[PDB]
A paper describes a structure:
Crystallographic studies were then undertaken to investigate the binding modes of methylarginine-containing peptides with JmjC enzymes. KDM4A, a close structural homologue of KDM4E that can also catalyse demethylation of methylarginine peptides (albeit less efficiently in our current assays), was selected for the crystallographic work because of its relatively robust crystallization properties and because it has previously been crystallized with Nɛ-methylated lysine peptide substrates. In the initial electron density maps, other than for the methylated arginine itself, only weak difference in electron densities were observed for residues in the substrate peptide, suggesting that the mode of methylated arginine peptide binding could be flexible. OMIT map (where different densities were calculated omitting H4R3me2s) as a guide to locate any unmodelled difference peak around the KDM4A (A/B) active sites. This unweighted omit map revealed more than one likely conformation of the methylated arginine side chains and traces of H4R3me2s peptide backbones; only major conformations were modelled and refined in the final structure. Although care should be taken in over-interpreting ‘static' crystal structures of substrate fragments, it is of interest that the arginine side chain was observed to adopt two different extended conformations after refinement. One orientation positions one of the methyl groups of the symmetrically dimethylated arginine residue sufficiently close to the metal centre to enable catalysis (within 4.5 Å). The other side chain orientation is a likely catalytically unproductive conformation, wherein the side chain is oriented away from the metal (for overlay, see Fig. 6c). The presence of such an unproductive binding conformation might in part account for the higher degree of uncoupled 2OG turnover stimulated by methylated arginine compared with methylated lysine peptide binding, as observed for KDM6B with H3(14–34)K27Rme2a (for overlay of arginine and lysine binding). As with the catalytic domain constructs, arginine demethylation was also observed with all four of the full-length proteins (KDM3A, KDM4A, KDM5C and KDM6B; note KDM4A was used in place of KDM4E as KDM4E is a pseudogene) tested on both ‘unnatural' and ‘natural' peptide substrates.
Two families of histone Nɛ-methyllysine demethylases (KDMs) have been identified; the flavin-dependent KDM1s (lysine-specific demethylase) and the Fe(II)- and 2-oxoglutarate (2OG)-dependent JmjC-domain-containing enzymes. Both families of KDMs operate via methyl-group oxidizing mechanisms that result in the co-production of formaldehyde. Here we report systematic studies on the potential of the catalytic domains of representative human JmjC enzymes to catalyse Nω-methylarginine demethylation. The results clearly demonstrate that some, but not all, purified JmjC KDMs can act as RDMs.
Numbering used by the authors: 3 to 355
Write the structure that this text describes.
């Protein structure tokens, strides 16, 4: 089909919008999907150079980080499990000082491949500290383009209808990273989209697996961590599992890599597995969002069954509003719709024309 013909390689795509294109978020997501970006599970958007979401970042040093986490990694042979050790609350100037410490600072290198090799070589040593999951935003209250605090997608239906707020999902998170800080392989909660903006600092590097191959990754993971898989159907949602690209290559898992610079956006797509690490001191802001296309993913997302605090969104409202003709069938457990990961979201239809 025409969707199979676009981005047939499922490679990560980079987009350079004009300020006019950049204005409407959902519309531009539908555009990049109409170009097949979603097939990679991950895409980069460089905003127009004339766009800035904050005046200056010089006031941050006093901002608080309630629960920094020390990332202890255990494993070998490209397979690792990451345990978080919550450290005491600390300011940003403290975190920055510790991050630029001779102990934790970035190593010297030339090509990115050298720093990547060093990452996968020393990942288990000198556990760094990640200032992750900090409630807040660095956007100025007047920025209307791609504002992570108010993107105005249909995910807003969760709060609007129920008042439920889910920190980091329909609210923004800040991530203060230092060298060697990692995010494990995962798809977003409820297999939503995510948006990640790198405010400032050293780059953040990403690996992505096309959604149409996600299941393969899962199978591989189950073979490597059979205990975890036995305990929980979706153990990858614990966000503790690190797998090196050489392991993926070795077992035929298709993936792609991209490096994220300050001032750039990354979009992750439904059921797009991703992982990565930070090069040094930096600050990112992210949240989740949805499109009509996500609804089916939401209905079929395989959720963690071993933790009672995992994120779970009621899909009822979305099915009633956008899939009325199926609601009954779905409530009776008979909606056997099959997801085609290559299709773009219906909102993109006008771009397809
Ligand atoms: O910033 C991080 O450490 C991890 N970010 C994501 O997984 C994301 O934006 O989808
Ligand atoms: Cl195991
Ligand atoms: Ni993510
Ligand atoms: Zn679980």
């Amino acid at each position: 089909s025409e969707s199979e013909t676009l981005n047939p390689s499922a490679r990560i795509m980079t987009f350079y919008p004009t300020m006019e294109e950049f204005r409407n978020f959902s519309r531009y997501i539908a555009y990049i999907e109409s170009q097949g970006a979603h097939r990679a599970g991950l895409a980069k958007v460089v905003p127009p150079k004339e766009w800035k979401p904050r005046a200056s970042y010089d006031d941050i040093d006093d901002l608080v980080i309630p629960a920094p986490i020390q990332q202890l990694v255990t494993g070998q042979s490209g397979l690792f499990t990451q345990y978080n050790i919550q450290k005491k609350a600390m300011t940003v100037r403290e975190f920055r000082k510790i991050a630029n410490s001779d102990k934790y600072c970035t190593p010297r290198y030339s090509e990115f491949e050298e720093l990547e090799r060093k990452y996968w070589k020393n990942l288990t040593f000198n556990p760094p500290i990640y200032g992750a999951d900090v409630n807040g935003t660095l956007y100025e209250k007047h920025v209307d383009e791609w504002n992570i605090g108010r993107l105005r997608t249909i995910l807003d239906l969760v709060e609007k209808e129920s008042g439920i707020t889910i920190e980091g999902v329909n609210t923004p998170y800040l991530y203060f990273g230092m060298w060697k800080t990692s995010f494990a392989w995962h798809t977003e909660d409820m297999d939503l989209y995510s948006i990640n903006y790198l405010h400032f600092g050293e780059p953040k590097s990403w690996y992505s697996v096309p959604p149409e191959h996600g299941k393969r990754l899962e199978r591989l993971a189950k073979g490597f961590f059979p205990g975890s898989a036995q305990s929980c159907e979706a153990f990858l949602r614990h966000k503790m599992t690190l797998i090196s690209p050489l392991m993926l290559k070795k077992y035929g898992i298709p993936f792609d890599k991209v490096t994220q610079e300050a001032g750039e956006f990354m979009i992750t797509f439904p059921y797009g597995y991703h992982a990565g690490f930070n090069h040094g001191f930096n600050c990112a802001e992210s949240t989740n969002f949805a499109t009509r296309r996500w609804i089916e993913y939401g209905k079929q997302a395989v959720l963690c069954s071993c933790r009672k605090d995992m994120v779970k969104i009621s899909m009822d409202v979305f099915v009633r509003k956008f899939q009325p003709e199926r609601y009954k069938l779905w409530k009776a457990g008979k909606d056997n719709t099959v997801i085609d990961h290559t299709l773009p979201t219906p909102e993109a239809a006008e771009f397809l024309k």
